[PDB]
Amino acid sequence: APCSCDGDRRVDCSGKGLTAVPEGLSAFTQALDISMNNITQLPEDAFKNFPFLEELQLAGNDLSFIHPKALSGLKELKVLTLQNNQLKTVPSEAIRGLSALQSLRLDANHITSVPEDSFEGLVQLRHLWLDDNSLTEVPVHPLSNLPTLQALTLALNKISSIPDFAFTNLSSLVVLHLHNNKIRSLSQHCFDGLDNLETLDLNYNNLGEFPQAIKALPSLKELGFHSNSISVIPDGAFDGNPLLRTIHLYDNPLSFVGNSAFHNLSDLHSLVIRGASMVQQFPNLTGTVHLESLTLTGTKISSIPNNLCQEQKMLRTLDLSYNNIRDLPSFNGCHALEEISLQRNQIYQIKEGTFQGLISLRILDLSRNLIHEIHSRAFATLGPITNLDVSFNELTSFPTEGLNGLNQLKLVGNFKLKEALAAKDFVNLRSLSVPYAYQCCAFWGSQIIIHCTPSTGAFKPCEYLLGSWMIRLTVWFIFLVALFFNLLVILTTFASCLPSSKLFIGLISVSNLFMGIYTGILTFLDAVSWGRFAEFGIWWETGSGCKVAGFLAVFSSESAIFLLMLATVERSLSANHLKQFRVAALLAFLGATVAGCFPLFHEYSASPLCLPFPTGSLGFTVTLVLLNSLAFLLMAVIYTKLYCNNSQSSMIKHVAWLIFTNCIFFCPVAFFSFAPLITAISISPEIMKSVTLIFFPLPACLNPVLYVFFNPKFKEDWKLLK
């Protein structure tokens, strides 16, 4: 086939790379399609062989120059297309005989300018396209020869401004597109004569002032000018546009908006305003009763008018975030509204009648406010609510009537909400997020799974504080032994009436007795609250008892590591000083106090075991660990010198055993104290909590044991005591 064909008397020579006009075709060819080839010019009477031509298509052909008699002879074709070409100037002297055109597609061309005598004889054209071009000005004079043009596009060009009386002859214009353009300014009377204009396009431009000249476009129904540089919509700017019904103005530096500028718009269907910070009061909405959305964000208004919902009967979406509203009105008569999103405001209270008559509500966003009280019956009138977001407020008690269908609930940030909510009034709940991890223990941490957020575990226990009945029974002996044997050592040491060795041993017995007092407090708490801990956990962690428990635990643990680093400096120094060793044993019992009194003011609240480093803030924990490690290193370094260096032989043996036991028993706690750094090969918190719970009070359990059944001076002093 010289050239691919079809059965509707049409030749479709696409995809062939012709270098000339096809020949030998039928004289009855209805449409000549020769697109996507490589011909650059046509001789005269190139299309004389086709007297009955209607649809000529040579787009994507890359024409360069046209002979001013080649296209002649076509006195009856309809649509001419020459896009994706490189025509520098319009065939103005060649389109004179093209008197039967209906659409001239000269877009996607290299047109830089049109001549004055263009568009003559085209009295039947309907569509004009000059898109993706390089025209510097609007062709006013040539456009004057188009009295019946129906749709004109002038976008993607290099025009900077449109002068006055530049569009009078286009009496049948209906579509005007000027997007991705550079025009900056326009005159008062530039747009006159377009009485039939219905859709106007000006977006993606740079007009710095409101195009007030739109007062003469009565038939405008779509108005898009978004992504511009406008900052004030004046007062009364849409008087001449009553049939208008869709405004586009988003992404602009709108700073101020007039109070009565949005009135008498009966066909408006949407309204979005974000960033008008200079607006102080709610706009006048008289005459606009068919609107479906009000998105007023970034504004300083303070009071919702008390009758929007008796006038806007078709409202569906209400978004008033990022405002300064303080008082909320009655929402009765808002039947079709389903998208209330009042957030980032200054509302402080919710009344009974605030949310009455809302039968179609489905979304609520009352977060980031200062609501301190909510009525019990407030939510009893609502219908099929699904989302309720009240997080990050100042609530103390949460009503529960009429919230059985809440699919998703959010409550985080209400720190003063101590009361624990029940699981009977939220049977149809899918996602919950509460202020304290122990309020989640009542939804179980059937068919579907809730997903609580502050998450429970073993360092935030939900039934037992200690663990199984093995960690329980061993903490009960470490308490009994550390109490009774320490009391016995104190009694025999400080009631025989001392040298500077015996006094130090008695003081390390006092600081072990206080540690035993701390672990006893822990086991009584576990015992009282057996079988349930949610009831007592909130009262314990946010209470004041945890402060005393932590004070005793840290004080007993660091007053016995500095009273054993001063007892190695009294043996190395026997290789005089009764006064000084007695005034340095007060500065060890008062230096210890500072550390505990300290975490009490600046923490003891990240575990129920009330310690500072079971887990680890990167403050007190790392400092305690570093100080204890250096003291133990120096303690061994000092004794190492004495190691290489009667009653003196018996005391040396006792202090060496004390230092070995205390060094050995401390390594598990130090090693597992750095849990986040190494995760202990993804060790379970339950397992490591156990070992940091048993092995921590252990050293202050055999110090008075080792000393009472294996040291010569305990026998003698016992006998001088009877």
Curated annotation (Swiss-Prot):
Free-text tissue specificity from the UniProt record: Expressed in multiple steroidogenic tissues: placenta, ovary, testis and adrenal. Expressed also in spinal cord, thyroid, stomach, trachea, heart, pancreas, kidney, prostate and spleen.
Assigned protein family: Belongs to the G-protein coupled receptor 1 family.
GO cellular component: plasma membrane
Metal-binding keyword on record: no
Domain LRRNT, first and last residues per copy: 1-27
Protein name from the UniProt record: Leucine-rich repeat-containing G-protein coupled receptor 4
GO biological process: bone mineralization; bone remodeling; circadian regulation of gene expression; digestive tract development; epithelial cell proliferation involved in renal tubule morphogenesis; hair follicle development; innate immune response; intestinal stem cell homeostasis
Entry's Gene Ontology molecular function annotations: G protein-coupled receptor activity; protein-hormone receptor activity; transmembrane signaling receptor activity
Record key words, sorted: Biological rhythms, Cell membrane, Developmental protein, Differentiation, Disulfide bond, G-protein coupled receptor, Glycoprotein, Immunity, Innate immunity, Leucine-rich repeat, Membrane, Osteoporosis, Phosphoprotein, Receptor, Repeat, Signal, Spermatogenesis, Transducer, Transmembrane, Transmembrane helix, Wnt signaling pathway
Record keyword Ribonucleoprotein present: no
Disease as annotated in the protein's UniProt record: Osteoporosis: A systemic skeletal disorder characterized by decreased bone mass and deterioration of bone microarchitecture without alteration in the composition of bone. The result is fragile bones and an increased risk of fractures, even after minimal trauma. Osteoporosis is a chronic condition of multifactorial etiology and is usually clinically silent until a fracture occurs.
Its membrane topology: Multi-pass membrane protein
Disulfide pattern: 3-13, 309-334, 440-452, 546-610
Extracellular side: 1-474, 525-548, 602-617, 684-689
Glycosylation sites: 38, 169, 264, 284
Stretch of the intact protein here: 31 to 816 of 951
Residue intervals passing through the bilayer: 475-495, 504-524, 549-569, 581-601, 618-638, 663-683, 690-710
Purpose of the protein: Receptor for R-spondins that potentiates the canonical Wnt signaling pathway and is involved in the formation of various organs. Upon binding to R-spondins (RSPO1, RSPO2, RSPO3 or RSPO4), associates with phosphorylated LRP6 and frizzled receptors that are activated by extracellular Wnt receptors, triggering the canonical Wnt signaling pathway to increase expression of target genes. In contrast to classical G-protein coupled receptors, does not activate heterotrimeric G-proteins to transduce the signal.
Domain of life: Eukaryota
Topological domain ranges for the Cytoplasmic compartment: 496-503, 639-662
